[PDB]
Design a protein around this ligand. Structure first.
Ligand code: CL7
Ligand code: SF4
Ligand code: SF4
Ligand code: SF4
Lengths: 144, 80, 21, 726, 659, 28, 30, 103, 94, 58
């Protein structure tokens, strides 16, 4: 369907205007309602860092030996550092308030202010580092 | 924004006005021409610098002329 | 065009017959 | 009667003033859509042009039969196919070109040719000079007949507009009479002429002792001797006893171990079944009796929840617009050509063709090039249709409307796919380059290191190679081709077909092909979709299909039309086809083709280095381009020197195309102004005012010389290498 | 706010602001609120900056070669030991490459010196690592002094006035006298006092030159006659460099010739030469409108200086191998070829820069009335005739030359090489009789170079002359030096500005120098390998080049890494491949133009704006495709970089295994 | 004399990161 | 003939000074 | 020139001992050798050499081909000019037709 | 003050964007003597209804092209173009 | 300057600077360029691809 207004460049296709996909997207930590920016940053950091640990320790130059997991943890932590630097330098320029869309009727207000972005990045850094170290220790423990 | 000035040598053939895609040009009376009217540009800030008016002008050499200068969001045709 | 084609044909035939012997 | 140049256009017959007039007359000559507004005249002109082109094709076929009958060693090759070689171009002994006559064998001299003409002639069993001369004369007569028909159907009996739009009747006649009966007649010719001739030739009797098919048709006992089942002169056709035809209508499905070609009986039942199916299926459209299907009733009823109106209104646009039909036919024709190229080398359909490597290579790559060009043509003419014949009134909420509505999503997702494919397909090659260059050979993407096996293709090969005798194909004798898998069946002294193995390199190469194909598709589909109107230029349709730009405003709008998009996409099509051809050439030399060895092995041409060399860019640059050019660069002072000469000339022409691609027309116009001033100073200024050529035709000229140079370069390389290797 | 030195760009919402701000950082004339005195002061400081950068570059040279080099071992054997430049530290390297990169008797991965710095330092007096280290330290000190002076001469108290700068004749005379004569005299003094005694075998340093004895005359005849006493005993034919065998006592001679061992000029002759230069300059220092228009426009001065620099750079490139001046450099071919190619390409770029900045002067600073009926207005009034005569000579030299090549090619191809067209280089043979051996190929190549040279001159002068105006646009002066076009009207006006003429001429410059270096390298490789008949009998037809030089000598370079192993030329093969790649990647900007990419970027903008988890992040500036001039410029840069990298990789890959 | 390992990763990685972030601050 | 640590360190501490002067000059220029 | 005549060159004779033919007559290349024996051939490549220095005794190598070409080019150029003057404004006032179709 | 009805349409991705609601947005109004289909510069074909009409477009050039190359040939020379500020205040440009 | 007389164009920015033209009509209006001239040659005016030109100028 047109999705609110046909004149706007949008379409209410079942891909993104379905009830289940709308609930799933609006319940994500970036879009969920009722939490502070720090919790959003924390959950996003843990999720993406726990992702990022894998490939570094799997396909690394020392993938065969036991140092592969340490290398993967270190690389994931470094990538989290880089992304946190990106967030802290993006928050300074004071970008614009994101607008409501078809999937999200009421976007969060935590990403429209400098302090909100700074808190999100602060949570993201800790989340990523914790996820990487947790993945490393878990993968070591499982092997015994 | 772009700047457009019209020299006093055009015959007032009016093709430049009807060739402009943003209606930057308009026609005003002017006794200096045999046709009694000369082109005017009251919305030079809306000009996109497409140089269609220069193509439309038959007078040699180009009584109308468009100079590309500072470009804003209006002059660059940004829809986003 | 056809006149040009026939003229160039005649001159190239002349060149080839000159180089034949 | 016709000495009035520019008459076909309103703004061309007034009188030349500049050379742009000449160039436009050349460009707008055959653009019938601009010369008139009536549709009946356009249809008549299309009909006449069709007949003229048919006459051209017939003249070409007549010339080929003529030159193969007169100046060829066809009979000597027919007597001993494995000893002699096909030959034509008996060059005149002149200033220096007499050396090009190679020693094709057994005393005869001339240029060895690889167009498969002799294989086609042997397929029809033509083994007599009178037969060939009669065929040539008949082809000339046919060409004259079609030319006169083109004259008659336009100047004397011009059809009407309503006649052309009979889509159902058109399909019924053109599918039954032209196609099914044509295939039936060809199958009859096969079974009644060619099969006995090929059987006699395989018997090794003589090339000239074969009686004319006159006696074949007059007699019945001859084929009874040749075919035991043919003795039933009163054939049990109505008796339905078709099982008594298992002698010349078989389903062997393989390769003949004597000539290295498809089984003739297989081809017989094949074309016969196709003729029967076409005859059966051509009776489906309502012509004039009210019985059968009809276009709109079956096309308008296939709607859906997503696609809204479905195919409502497409019949009108497809019956009132020539360009859409041209685009569809062109795309399908190019796809058919590529399919032919793919399916011909796997199953050699002519006798003594698999052994001849040069002919197989040339046909493969040539028909691939044709397919690519025709596909690009389909895309282009679709763009013309969208910019010219599009009608909002007939198209609303139907297919085309919703296509134009979610075009932005299409382009975005297609671009993302193109970028992802480019990275994860070419970064693999660059990554392999770095890993091998750093002395770390255990980190490459190869068989000796972390490997990317093409498991799906291996599974499909396993399924297709062992399908004979199963439930789906119980009567099949063998696998459709040895390419799926099989012991190398080598005839003469060289391998005719073998199992084309698959691995990491082949996976990477097929995924490179996918990357380039989706990229070219992105270019063409973006041009087609945005040819009408975009955000940048809201009224792009009114500018036309072929315009150079829209001024320097809006930040610069160079190369925005659909013609510009087609010009950009032609380069990418060239790149994709060149990569495909390189893949095929190296793969065959390294895995398939070769000479049989006595100890059970096969002496491959390139010693099987495809596995360890075709995974790095430097690997290509060394083992293929630098290595296989030894034959072409040393061809001088020999019978293959022409290939080296054309190699150099093609590099030169490709380097010349940059002169038009890399520059603009303002500088050239100023230089031409200075030059015409110089000519005028001596009062020899031409009346036609010299003018620098337009932007669009400059781009077209650069593109044309570019494609010429690249294609001739590749062609000379392939021919020199494969002819010198033998 | 960036760029702060503008207002039009500061209000540009799109990303074009960044590109155009970076584009005109050093366009000091166009900054808003700029005065001439500020212009000259900033120019002074910036020249100090470039000088300091050069000095620090040389200091890094010296320090790195002193720390990680093998100077002493190479001194002990300047023939069978390859100099090294800087040790290799790359974590991404493998073990096999690490083992294969240990060469020249080193103790790890090191990269070789292909610039002949070792020989130059040996000739001037360097004999130990301590000297090199002290030189590097002194260079850093002088660079720091230069930087501090650049900062200091900007302070309000020490800021020079515009009137001081306006004395262009006075500063130019002071330059030509002092900066040349005094510097040459000082270098000659260094030579005589240290370098020649160092060559003779006796150690001389900063702690000994005060009490050392350069010549028994003891400077007495320098103020009187009997100057011939300075050359009473030159060196000996059997004299060994760096040894007292046959060492003479002369310091200023004019013997000429080549040393029997080092195969270079005599140090005494070089000292004599720089002394004659110094005295001539010292003597000459005290002693219509063109000579004043030169002092009126900055760009005229810049163009003249660049043209002179390019000409003298070509002269240096020719002489450095015609007359080698460094010991043990004629037995090391690779560095000789590299230096020749390098300064030749530099000379070409300098000449093109002269032409471009001259066109800039014509656009900006030219005045009709003040330059009325001078040597300059005559060229502008008769541009058409000179352009026409250039076109005639270009086509006359090109048509017939290409015909000769292709005719020889096709005649040889048909197996009858006894009927080609061979024209002897008679004038070169006459001048040599009244160097190397020249045949038909050398004749043809010199003629082809002349053809391409006149062609490049044609484009350059056409752009310079039509920069002010033309028939298509009689008001090109008002449109500035660089602008995209004038729209599709009047038949289309793509690629019209004088900047575009520079754009066009760059490719022809590249082709000309490429032909020059191809010729030089092929002849020298034929000579060095002991096979000269190859060049003589295989350079008449164009096919011989492809199958002999390009294909023939790119056989071991292309084998840098193989499925069997890795050798020492792996990095050069990688650079070769990167060279073809970087040349190819410019074709995108050369061929495809902006509008298609702008539409694509608009589509991408829509895609970004309508996706979850990404609308939260928005661009500060609206993305747009690169402008037309930006596309041309970036394509040209990629093209030139790929060309240079490819040929350098080929040169070292082909010449290094030979030696 | 193990300054390579201490210096090259530093001056490359941290140097480029600092330069890039400083320039990003500069253009806004 | 091989450079010991002391000269490397003193060379580096000399090299610090031109860095500071260059930074000051750049700041003064703009 | 500093070269030897091709007749006295031994390796030129050796090269001439083995050659291909152009005309169908078997003795079509050898006669080309005796035609080329009047020139001078170096002792490295053994090929005829064309002198551009304009000697009195060797004027036929380059001077007379140049005269032949300049005569031919002048003839065709003058013919084109004569056709242009005789088929322009002075003849038909509409020379556009006179350039697209010619007599 | 910009009174009218939106012509019938199914919704397309070529319409307004985020910057339309923040910096600027343009509107075009006209009256129709009947109901008929017409092409829009944002892609696809819409069916304008009887009487008044109101269309919102991102760029002035789009509205002018729609009113010049399409509305003129439909014998409709009574189209007004408005420049609509984000706050809600509007001005007439034609 | 009368109808049917040849003139030489002195305007430097014109396409026909220093070539002969023939006058076609002169009026007594107040415009600064009342003379009209017909030229045998056509100017550059027109979009790219056009095969015509303008032979008249004030
Ligand atoms: C005209 C400028 C000039 C002057 C005044 C000058 N030389 Mg030269 N000059 C010499 C001596 C000399 C002396 C002793 C002397 C003063 O008494 C001078 N010159 C003076 C020889 C050592 C040396 C070899 C001359 C040679 O071998 O010829 C020389 C050269 C050379 C040149 C050039 C271009 C010059 N010069 C130029 C000059 C070599 O290429 C050429 C050169 O070095 O090539 C790299
Ligand atoms: S097109 Fe030119 S001559 Fe005509 S009215 Fe406009 S400015 Fe005047
Ligand atoms: S350049 Fe285009 S938008 Fe500007 S005034 Fe001329 S026609 Fe109108
Ligand atoms: S450079 Fe050429 S194509 Fe591009 S805007 Fe200008 S006239 Fe048009």
């Amino acid at each position: 369907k047109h999705g609110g207004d046909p004149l706007v460049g949008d379409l209410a296709t079942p891909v993104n205007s379905s009830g289940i996909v709308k609930a799933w997207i609006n319940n994500l930590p970036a879009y969920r309602k009722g939490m502070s920016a720090n919790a959003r940053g924390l959950e996003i950091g843990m999720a993406h860092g726990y992702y990022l640990y894998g490939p570094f320790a799997t396909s690394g130059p020392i993938r065969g030996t036991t140092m592969s997991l340490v290398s993967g943890v270190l690389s994931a932590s470094a990538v989290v550092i880089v992304l946190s630097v990106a967030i802290q330098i993006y928050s300074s320029v004071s970008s614009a308030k994101p607008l409501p869309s078809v999937t999200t009727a009421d976007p969060g207000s935590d990403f429209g202010t400098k302090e909100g972005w700074s808190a999100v990045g602060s949570g993201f850094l800790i989340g990523g580092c914790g996820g990487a170290v947790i993945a490393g220790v878990l993968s070591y423990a499982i092997a015994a | 924004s772009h700047t457009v000035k019209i020299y006093d040598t055009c015959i007032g053939c009016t093709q430049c006005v009807r060739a402009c895609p943003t209606d930057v040009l308009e026609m005003v009376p002017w006794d200096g021409c045999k046709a009694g009217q000369i082109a005017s540009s009251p919305r030079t800030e809306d000009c996109v610098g497409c140089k269609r008016c220069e193509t439309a002008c038959p007078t040699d050499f180009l009584s109308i002329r468009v100079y590309l200068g500072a470009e804003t969001t209006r002059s660059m045709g940004l829809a986003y | 065009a056809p006149v040009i084609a026939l003229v160039f044909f005649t001159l190239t035939a002349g060149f080839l017959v000159e180089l034949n012997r | 009667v016709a000495g009035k140049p520019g008459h076909f256009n309103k703004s061309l017959s007034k009188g030349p003033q500049t050379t742009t007039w000449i160039w436009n007359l050349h460009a707008l000559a055959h653009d019938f859509d601009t010369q008139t507004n009536d549709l009946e005249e356009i249809s008549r002109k299309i009909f006449s042009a069709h007949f003229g082109h048919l006459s051209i094709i017939f003249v070409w076929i007549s010339g080929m039969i003529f030159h193969a009958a007169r100046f060829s060693n066809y009979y000597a090759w027919l007597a001993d196919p494995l000893g002699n070689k096909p030959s034509a171009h008996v060059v005149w002994p002149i200033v220096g070109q007499d050396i090009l006559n190679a020693d094709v064998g057994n005393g005869f001299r001339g240029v060895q040719i690889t167009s498969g003409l002799f294989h086609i002639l042997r397929g029809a069993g033509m083994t007599d000079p009178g037969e060939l001369y009669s065929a040539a004369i008949g082809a000339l007569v046919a060409a004259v007949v079609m030319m006169y028909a083109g004259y008659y159907h336009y100047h004397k009996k011009a059809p009407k507009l309503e006649w052309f739009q009979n889509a159902e009747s058109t399909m019924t006649h053109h599918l039954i009479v032209l196609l099914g009966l044509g295939n039936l007649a060809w199958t009859g010719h096969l079974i009644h002429v060619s099969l006995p001739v090929n059987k006699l030739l395989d018997s090794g009797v003589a090339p000239q002792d074969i009686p004319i098919p006159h006696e074949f048709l007059f007699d019945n006992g001859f084929m009874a001797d040749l075919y035991p089942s043919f003795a039933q002169g009163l054939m049990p056709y109505f008796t339905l006893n078709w099982g008594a035809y298992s002698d010349f209508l078989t389903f062997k499905g393989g390769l003949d171990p004597t000539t290295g070609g498809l089984w003739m009986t297989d081809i017989a039942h094949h074309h016969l079944a196709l003729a029967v199916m076409y005859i059966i299926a051509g009776h489906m459209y309502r012509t004039n009796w009210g019985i059968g299907h009809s276009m709109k009733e079956i096309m308008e009823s296939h709607k859906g929840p997503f696609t809204g109106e479905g195919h409502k209104g497409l019949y009108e646009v497809l019956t009132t617009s020539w360009h859409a039909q041209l685009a569809i036919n062109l795309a399908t024709w190019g796809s058919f050509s590529i399919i032919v190229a793919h399916h011909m080398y796997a199953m050699p359909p002519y006798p003594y063709l698999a052994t001849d490597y040069g002919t197989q290579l040339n046909l493969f790559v040539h028909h691939m090039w044709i397919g690519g060009f025709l596909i690009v043509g389909g895309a282009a003419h679709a763009a013309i249709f969208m910019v010219r014949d599009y009608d909002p009134a007939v198209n609303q909420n139907n297919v085309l409307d919703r296509m134009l509505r979610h075009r932005d999503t299409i382009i975005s997702h297609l671009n993302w796919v193109c970028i992802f494919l480019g990275f994860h397909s070419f970064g693999l090659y660059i990554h392999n380059d770095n890993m091998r260059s750093l002395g770390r050979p255990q980190d490459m993407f190869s068989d000796t290191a972390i490997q990317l096996q093409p498991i799906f293709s291996q599974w499909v090969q396993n399924l297709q190679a062992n399908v004979a005798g199963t439930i789906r194909a119980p009567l099949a004798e063998g696998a459709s081709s040895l390419a799926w898998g099989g012991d190398p069946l080598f005839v003469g002294g060289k391998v005719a077909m073998q199992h084309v193995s698959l691995g990491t390199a082949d996976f990477m190469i097929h995924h490179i092909h996918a990357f380039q194909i989706h990229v070219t598709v992105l270019i063409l589909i973006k041009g087609v979709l945005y040819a009408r109107s975009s955000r940048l230029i809201p009224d792009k349709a009114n500018l036309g299909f072929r315009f150079p730009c829209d001024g320097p405003g809006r930040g610069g709008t160079c190369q925005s039309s659909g013609w510009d998009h087609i010009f950009l996409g032609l380069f990418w099509m060239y790149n994709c086809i060149s990569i495909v051809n390189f893949h095929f050439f190296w793969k065959m030399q390294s895995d398939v083709w070769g000479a049989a060895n006595a100890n059970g092995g096969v002496n491959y041409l390139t010693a099987g280095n495809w596995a360890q060399s075709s995974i790095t860019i430097n690997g290509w640059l060394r083992d293929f381009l630098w290595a296989q050019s030894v034959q072409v660069i040393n061809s001088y002072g020999s019978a293959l020197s022409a290939y080296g000469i054309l190699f150099l000339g093609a590099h030169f022409i490709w380097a010349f195309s940059l002169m038009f691609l890399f520059s603009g027309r303002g500088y050239w116009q100023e230089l031409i102004e200075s030059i015409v001033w110089a000519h005028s100073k001596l009062k020899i200024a031409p009346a036609i005012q010299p003018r620098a050529m337009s932007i669009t035709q400059g781009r077209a000229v650069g593109l044309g010389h570019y494609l010429l140079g690249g294609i001739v370069t590749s062609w000379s390389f392939y021919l020199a290498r494969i002819l010198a290797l033998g | 706010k960036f760029p702060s030195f503008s207002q039009d760009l500061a209000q540009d919402p799109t990303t074009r602001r960044i590109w155009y701000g970076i584009a005109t950082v050093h366009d000091f004339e166009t900054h808003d609120g700029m005065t001439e005195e500020n212009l000259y002061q900033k120019i002074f400081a910036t020249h100090f900056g470039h000088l300091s950068i050069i000095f620090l570059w040389s200091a890094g040279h010296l320090f790195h070669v002193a720390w990680q080099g093998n100077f002493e071992q190479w001194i002990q054997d300047p023939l069978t030991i390859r100099p090294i430049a800087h040790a290799i530290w790359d974590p991404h390297l493998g073990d096999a490459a690490t083992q294969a990169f240990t060469q020249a008797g080193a103790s790890g991965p090191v990269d070789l010196c292909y610039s002949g710095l070792y020989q130059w330092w040996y000739t001037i007096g360097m004999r130990t690592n301590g000297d090199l280290y002290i030189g590097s330290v002194f260079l850093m000190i002088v660079a720091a002094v230069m930087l501090f002076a650049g900062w200091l001469h900007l302070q309000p108290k020490f800021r020079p006035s515009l009137a001081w700068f306006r004395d262009a004749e006075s500063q130019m005379n002071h330059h030509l006298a002092v900066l040349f004569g005094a510097s040459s005299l000082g270098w000659t003094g260094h030579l005589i006092h240290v370098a020649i005694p160092e060559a003779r075998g006796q150690h001389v340093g900063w702690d000994n030159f005060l009490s050392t004895m350069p010549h028994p005359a003891g400077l007495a005849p320098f103020f009187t006659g009997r100057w011939g006493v300075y050359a009473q005993n030159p060196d000996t034919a059997g004299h060994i460099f760096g040894t007292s065998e046959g060492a003479g006592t002369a310091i200023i001679t004019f013997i000429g010739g080549f040393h029997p061992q080092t195969e270079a000029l005599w140090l005494t002759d070089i000292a004599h030469h720089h002394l004659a230069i110094a005295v001539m300059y010292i003597i000459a220092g005290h002693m219509k409108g063109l000579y004043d228009t030169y002092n009126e426009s900055l760009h005229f001065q810049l163009g003249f200086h660049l043209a002179a620099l390019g000409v003298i750079t070509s002269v240096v490139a020719q002489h450095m191998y015609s007359l080698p001046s460094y010991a043990f450099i004629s037995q090391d071919h690779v560095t000789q070829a590299a230096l020749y190619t390098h300064h030749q390409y530099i000379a070409g770029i300098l000449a093109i820069g002269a032409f471009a900045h001259g066109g800039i002067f014509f656009v900006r600073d030219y005045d009709p009335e003040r330059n009325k009926n001078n040597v300059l207005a005559r060229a502008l009034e008769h541009k058409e005739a000179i352009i026409s005569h250039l076109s005639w000579v270009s086509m006359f030299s090109g048509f017939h030359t290409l015909g000769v090549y292709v005719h020889n090619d096709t005649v040889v191809a048909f197996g009858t090489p006894e009927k080609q067209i061979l024209v002897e280089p008679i004038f070169a043979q006459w001048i040599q009789a009244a160097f190397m051996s020249q045949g038909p190929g050398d004749f043809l190549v010199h003629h082809g170079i002349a053809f391409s040279l006149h062609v490049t001159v044609l484009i350059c002068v056409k752009g310079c002359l039509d920069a002010r105006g033309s028939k298509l646009m009689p008001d090109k002066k008002d449109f500035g030096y660089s602008f995209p076009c004038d729209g599709p009207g009047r038949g289309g006006t793509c690629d019209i500005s004088a900047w575009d003429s520079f754009y066009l001429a760059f490719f022809w410059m590249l082709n000309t120098i490429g032909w020059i270096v191809f010729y030089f390298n092929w002849k020298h490789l034929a000579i060095w390998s002991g096979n000269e008949a190859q060049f003589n009998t295989n350079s008449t037809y164009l096919m011989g080049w492809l199958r002999d030089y390009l294909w023939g000598y790119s056989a071991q370079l292309i084998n840098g890494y193989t499925p069997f192993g890795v050798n020492s030329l792996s990095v050069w093969a990688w650079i070769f491949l990167l060279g073809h790649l970087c040349w190819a990647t410019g074709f995108l900007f050369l061929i495809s133009w902006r509008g298609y990419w702008q539409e694509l970027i608009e589509t991408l903008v829509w895609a970004h704006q309508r996706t979850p988890l990404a609308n939260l992040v928005t661009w500060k500036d609206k993305p747009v495709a690169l402008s037309i001039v930006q596309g041309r410029l970036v394509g040209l840069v990629h093209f030139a970089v790929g060309y240079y990298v490819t040929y350098a990789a080929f040169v070292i890959g082909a010449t290094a295994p030979l030696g | 004399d193990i300054l390579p390992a201490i210096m090259t990763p530093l001056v490359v990685l941290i140097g480029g990161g600092a330069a890039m972030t400083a320039f990003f601050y500069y253009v806004e | 003939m091989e450079l010991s640590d002391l000269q490397i360190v003193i060379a580096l501490v000399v090299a610090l000074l031109p860095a500071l002067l260059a930074l000051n000059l750049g700041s003064a220029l703009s | 020139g500093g070269l030897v005549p091709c007749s006295e060159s031994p390796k030129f004779q050796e090269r001439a001992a083995k050659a291909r033919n152009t005309t169908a007559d078997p003795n079509s290349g050898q006669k080309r050798f005796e035609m080329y024996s009047s020139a001078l051939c170096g002792p490295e490549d053994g090929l005829p050499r064309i002198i551009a220095g304009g000697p009195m005794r060797r004027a036929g190598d380059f001077l007379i081909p140049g005269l032949f070409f300049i005569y031919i080019a002048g003839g065709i150029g003058n013919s084109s000019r004569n056709y242009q003057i005789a088929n322009r404004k002075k003849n038909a006032k509409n020379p556009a037709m006179g350039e697209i179709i010619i007599d | 003050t910009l009174t009218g009805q939106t012509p019938l349409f199914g919704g397309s991705t070529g319409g307004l964007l985020s910057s339309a609601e923040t910096e600027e947005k343009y509107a075009i109004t006209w009256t129709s003597p009947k109901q008929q289909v017409f092409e829009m510069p944002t892609g696809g074909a819409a069916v304008m209804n009887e009487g008044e009409n109101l269309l919102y477009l991102a760029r002035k050039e789009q509205c002018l092209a729609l009113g010049l190359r399409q509305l003129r040939t439909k014998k409709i020379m009574d189209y007004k173009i408005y420049r609509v500020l984000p706050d809600g205040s509007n001005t007439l440009l034609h | 300057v009368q109808r049917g007389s040849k003139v030489r164009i002195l305007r430097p920015e014109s396409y026909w600077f220093r070539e002969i033209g023939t006058v076609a009509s002169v009026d007594q209006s107040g415009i600064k360029y009342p003379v009209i001239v017909r030229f045998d040659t056509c100017n550059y005016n027109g979009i790219s691809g056009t095969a015509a030109g303008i032979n008249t100028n004030n």
